Amino acid sequence: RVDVSLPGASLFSGGLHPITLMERELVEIFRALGYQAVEGPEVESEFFNFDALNIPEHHPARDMWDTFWLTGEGFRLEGPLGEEVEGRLLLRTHTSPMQVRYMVAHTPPFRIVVPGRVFRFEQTDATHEAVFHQLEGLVVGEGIAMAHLKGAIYELAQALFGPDSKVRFQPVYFPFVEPGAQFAVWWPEGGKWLELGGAGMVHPKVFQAVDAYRERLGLPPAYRGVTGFAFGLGVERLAMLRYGIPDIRYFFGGRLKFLEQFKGVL
Amino acid sequence: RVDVSLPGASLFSGGLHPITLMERELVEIFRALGYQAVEGPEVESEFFNFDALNIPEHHPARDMWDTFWLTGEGFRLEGPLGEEVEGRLLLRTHTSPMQVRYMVAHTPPFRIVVPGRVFRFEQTDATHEAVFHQLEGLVVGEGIAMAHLKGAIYELAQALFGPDSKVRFQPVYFPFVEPGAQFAVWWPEGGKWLELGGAGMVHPKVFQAVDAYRERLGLPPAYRGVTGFAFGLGVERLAMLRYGIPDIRYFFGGRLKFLEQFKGVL
Numbered sequence: 039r040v041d042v043s044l045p046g047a048s049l050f051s052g053g054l055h056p057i058t059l060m061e062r063e064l065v066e067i068f069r070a071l072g073y074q075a076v077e078g079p080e081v082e083s084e085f086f087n088f089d090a091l092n093i094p095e096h097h098p099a100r101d102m103w104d105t106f107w108l109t110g111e112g113f114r115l116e117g118p119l120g121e122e123v124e125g126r127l128l129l130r131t132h133t134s135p136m137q138v139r140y141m142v143a144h145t146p147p148f149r150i151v152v153p154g155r156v157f158r159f160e161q162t163d164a165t166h167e168a169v170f171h172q173l174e175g176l177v178v179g180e181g182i183a184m185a186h187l188k189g190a191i192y193e194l195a196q197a198l199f200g201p202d203s204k205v206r207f208q209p210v211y212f213p214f215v216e217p218g219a220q221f222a223v224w225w226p227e228g229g230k231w232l233e234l235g236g237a238g239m240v241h242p243k244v245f246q247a248v249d250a251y252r253e254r255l256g257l258p259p260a261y262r263g264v265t266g267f268a269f270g271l272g273v274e275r276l277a278m279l280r281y282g283i284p285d286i287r288y289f290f291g292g293r294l295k296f297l298e299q300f301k302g303v304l
Numbered sequence: 305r306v307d308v309s310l311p312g313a314s315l316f317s318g319g320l321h322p323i324t325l326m327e328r329e330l331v332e333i334f335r336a337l338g339y340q341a342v343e344g345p346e347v348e349s350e351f352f353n354f355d356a357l358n359i360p361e362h363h364p365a366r367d368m369w370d371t372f373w374l375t376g377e378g379f380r381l382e383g384p385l386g387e388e389v390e391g392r393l394l395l396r397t398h399t400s401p402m403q404v405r406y407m408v409a410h411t412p413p414f415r416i417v418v419p420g421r422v423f424r425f426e427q428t429d430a431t432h433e434a435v436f437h438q439l440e441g442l443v444v445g446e447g448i449a450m451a452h453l454k455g456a457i458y459e460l461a462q463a464l465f466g467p468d469s470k471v472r473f474q475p476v477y478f479p480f481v482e483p484g485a486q487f488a489v490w491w492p493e494g495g496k497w498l499e500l501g502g503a504g505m506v507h508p509k510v511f512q513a514v515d516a517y518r519e520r521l522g523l524p525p526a527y528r529g530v531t532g533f534a535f536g537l538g539v540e541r542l543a544m545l546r547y548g549i550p551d552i553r554y555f556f557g558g559r560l561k562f563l564e565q566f567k568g569v570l
């Protein structure tokens with residue numbers, strides 16, 4: 039007899055990592071809203087990570103990010119236009135520096151979303167990591183207002199949690215935005231207010247840093263008569279609440295018994 | 305010796321059909337503009353294919369579509385709300401009937417794009433087919449104007465052919481739109497004006513047919529104070545110009561030597 043219910047050739051079946059899944063969904067959501075995804079480098083200079091974003095040194099505000107400083111010659115970090123740049127190297131503490139790199143290399147109006155791995159010197163536990171992911175958002179152009187930032191997050195919530203979903207905005211501080219704000223979303227199933235990220239209207243000094251670097255590079259100013267909003271949200275926190283994952287350390291853990299569990303969600 | 309440059313296990317490598325590729329790119333382009341993709345049935349009733357779209361019978365305008373009529377009992381065609389519907393069956397001669405199905409099942413404002421296989425009784429040659437594909441576009445809502453239709457096509461052209469690309473609109477006739485129009489795009493490489501499809505502001509009678517079917521079904525009217533634009537473009541013509549394909553008959557031909565050639569473009 040030709041047993042048809044017998045195991046067939048053991049061809050391998052692949053899968054995508056949960057962060058890749060979460061990031062993808064997040065990118066899909068924003069693509070539908072007109073956002074384009076671009077990435078930045080993990081090793082940045084203090085200039086892009088801090089100074090260009092209105093976060094000076096010995097600044098009590100620079101303590102909001104526990105930085106990993108680097109050392110070593112021979113490494114050539116290129117700027118927005120491929121040009122080699124200088125400054126104390128570090129691991130970006132957020133994706134925000136990409137806001138600056140992009141703006142000097144392009145012209146408004148535009149919509150970008152920049153995903154990426156970030157690093158912060160912290161003790162890795164159940165809900166904390168030294169290595170995680172963020173997703174930046176940047177929309178610049180004439181007449182761009184905070185009403186648009188609120189509109190963006192509102193669409194994010196709807197797409198993420200359904201029609202019974204809602205967002206709340208509260209003032210908060212960031213050197214690169216003003217007005218500044220933190221936003222939370224209403225997750226119906228969990229019946230809880232989830233804090234997703236921060237945002238605001240691009241700070242006046244950011245545009246100045248951008249155009250200053252531009253002239254210093256030969257390009258003409260492109261940000262004097264425009265405004266914009268930016269936002270940044272943590273990927274793991276969201277991936278966890280969405281795939282029901284208890285420990286954030288698994289993401290980098292490597293357990294196949296763990297990763298394999300997302301072959302379904304592709 | 306362990307020859308490392310020797311052929312490895314012959315694992316199969318798949319691929320996607322050129323129309324799937326073209327359709328995907330077209331859907332990606334419109335998703336970025338806020339459009340969502342929904343499909344309709346290939347076997348339609350005269351009501352959705354013609355009557356609901358202001359194309360009555362014995363109408364000199366109904367001759368713009370060479371219809372394939374069908375026969376046979378036992379077949380149960382369901383309407384927008386799953387309800388069984390009646391009328392002379394046929395193979396849709398375009399995707400347009402989906403405009404009607406969607407509108408009765410949802411509420412404005414929205415943006416849809418409906419891809420799909422269509423059929424027309426014609427002699428299949430080098431640049432003609434009885435079985436091809438179209439991509440519909442429908443955007444409805446308060447204050448929606450033709451300026452938006454032109455804006456849509458403009459973005460389509462840019463995304464498809466680059467910044468040196470441009471679109472031209474000329475009046476043309478369609479029973480389901482008014483104003484009516486045909487649009488062509490400027491393809492820089494070929495230095496020629498390509499005619500892509502037709503479009504216009506949803507015809508007043510279409511909205512009426514929609515709301516009439518709605519009440520006849522218990523739903524409340526939803527299209528009395530809105531306007532909208534619609535467009536439809538041929539997929540093969542575009543796929544051909546874009547992948548440099550000479551004969552439109554290949555698509556359905558089945559030659560692996562042909563299909564295999566698009567494993568690259570995924």
Ligand SMILES: N[C@@H](Cc1ccccc1)C(=O)O
Nearest residue numbers: 132134212236237268269270
């Ligand atoms: N970079 C910020 C997030 C953020 C991005 C953009 C604007 C405002 C806040 C952080 O690490 O928290």
Ligand SMILES: N[C@@H](Cc1ccccc1)C(=O)O
Nearest residue numbers: 398400478502503534535536
């Ligand atoms: N259905 C039309 C195309 C079209 C769609 C929508 C509006 C106008 C024209 C055709 O077959 O040519």
